[PDB]
Design a protein around this ligand. Structure first.
Ligand code: VMH
Lengths: 119, 118
């Protein structure tokens, strides 16, 4: 038993991370700017256990992974977290279940997931 | 602010706790499963407080049953203007589907289910 947060009211909270799904399709850069305007970043995958809700996410959504692969915050992609699969020539990646990243053209519009860490 | 309290591995949203269960069970077995977790099946009371339900994919048991109207496990009645009820099978139980639909279903049919706690 626990509390979850802190998060803004309109975000899903799970294991002290805040998540928000955006259905208006945008390219990777526009998606990044949208999350930033909400004091957040695109989804960062750092723990299969602490982010196991991602097993339930269907369809395909921008996350903050760019091409080695690294996150927006400049940190590296830890091994054993995502299976990166070629799909379209590009330097950005879409999250899909379960813990997959599909390589995609950064200019192609897609739905996206923003995330705020609380620590 | 903070959301909860909830059990550690449940989703929290606007102070309600939600858990999806992938093992298919009939309505009665699903009700017993949620009760074992000191919870109940999903109750829908507000499209605003529960707008995350717009994002739910597929069909899942909720706590709505027919006896002279539809009622939740807790005995309260279905509020008007909350769910569109759709009938394509003979039954006395209902599956939730987005967006704010209830599909009448045979209580004996195995389905995935959503538990909720508050
Ligand atoms: C992109 N989005 C939005 C998805 O993918 C959504 N996924 C499913 O709703 C979803 C898909 C499945 C599933 C397995 C195989 N096919 N499908 C559709 C099986 C179950 C669910 C599910 C059911 C109930 C709940 C609930 F009620 F406990 F919360 C949460 C998920 C989604 C992912 C993560 C969180 C949410 C939510 F609801 F919290 F906002 C929704």
């Amino acid at each position: 038993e626990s509390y979850c947060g802190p998060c803004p009211k309109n975000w899903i909270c799970y294991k002290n991370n805040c998540y928000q799904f955006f259905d208006e399709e945008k390219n990777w850069y526009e998606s990044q700017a949208s999350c930033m305007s909400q004091n957040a970043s695109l989804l960062k995958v750092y723990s299969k256990e602490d982010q196991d809700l991602l097993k339930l996410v269907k369809s395909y959504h921008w996350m903050g992974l760019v091409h080695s692969w690294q996150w927006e915050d400049g940190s590296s992609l830890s091994p054993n977290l995502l299976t990166i699969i070629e799909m379209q020539k590009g330097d950005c990646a879409l999250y899909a279940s379960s813990f997959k990243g599909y390589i995609e053209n950064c200019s192609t519009p897609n739905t996206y997931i923003c995330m705020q860490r609380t620590v």
